[PDB]
């Protein structure tokens, strides 16, 4: 039984341009645990991204938090890109903010 990941993107603090913040991508509810997750800035992969230790829920599905420190600008768009055996193509979820 394969389970596709839920993908949620959020910032630690309100977006304020030129102010340091944290970008989060919480990926959950997936099986098997083999997964590839990237944080994207303007469609380009962000180099220094940390993640939590792999864990799983009561229903045995896995979950991970990916995050990175960042400073937003007016110009920049951020997203989370996920690939998993359940996905015929990498799934991309944008960070929605008001600009």
């Amino acid at each position: 039984i394969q389970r596709t990941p839920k993908i949620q993107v959020y910032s630690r603090h309100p977006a304020e341009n030129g102010k340091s913040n944290f970008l989060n991508c919480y990926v959950s509810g997936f099986h098997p645990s083999d997964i590839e997750v990237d944080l994207l800035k303007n469609g380009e992969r962000i180099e220094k991204v940390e993640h939590s230790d792999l864990s799983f829920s009561k229903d045995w599905s896995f979950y991970l938090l990916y995050y990175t420190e960042f400073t937003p600008t007016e110009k920049d768009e951020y997203a989370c890109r996920v690939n998993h055996v359940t996905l015929s193509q990498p799934k991309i979820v944008k960070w929605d903010r008001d600009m």
């Binding site: 603090h13 098997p32 645990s33 230790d53 864990s55 008001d98």
Partner: protein
Amino acid sequence: PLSFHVIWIASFKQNLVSGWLSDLQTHTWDSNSSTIVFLWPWSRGNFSNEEWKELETLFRIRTIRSFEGIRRYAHELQFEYPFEIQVTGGCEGSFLQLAYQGSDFVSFQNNSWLPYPVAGNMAKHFCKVLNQNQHENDITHNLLSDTCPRFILGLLDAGKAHLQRQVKPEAWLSHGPSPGPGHLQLVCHVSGFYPKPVWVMWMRGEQEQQGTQRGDILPSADGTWYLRATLEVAAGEAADLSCRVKHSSLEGQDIVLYWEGSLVPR
């Protein structure tokens, strides 16, 4: 629900062992060091340096035996590559459960491993392998019934400081991305709060707006929580709306934000 548990994730290669106080990770096992990493000062609980040495050796031989144990018995039990084994065990009452390929497979009850009935004879034959040495099953029982209760008591004591802290939320408002035609999606973000229980509603004055859709509570790396609450409304009806947040850390003084300014706009 006050509980401690250990989890094992093995993929066939990858072997991860970690300890948890509910959502909160407290321990990690490093195999090459063959040591138990304590993630917090108080992760050691009321257990002494020498007793932790004892636990490490048990964790030593048990993990490597089991990892390599699975690694060897695969063909017999019809385990096809790739496959994953997950187990979790701990106490609150105790428990120890094993999944294969993300499904309930076997569990440890009293003194032996029992197959989940819906898991077929494949599970039953795994139980025969797991129930070879009765003494080793007896060690497992004592780990769960004796050691784990003792441990969790000390851990909660030593961790009471960190565990019972109050961290105030911060909140903000934005436009949601997917409103239906003629409508807006108002979103109220709440972050930085601990502990977890929280209350958030869109309001018209003192009237709670029952259209308020609260998302999952999500983690942050600093150990605090995050939540978004959205409200869909007709665009000509978004005046005088506010988002109200209540939390134990605020002691009665709710955060209240108003849909206004450039949000409206004007």
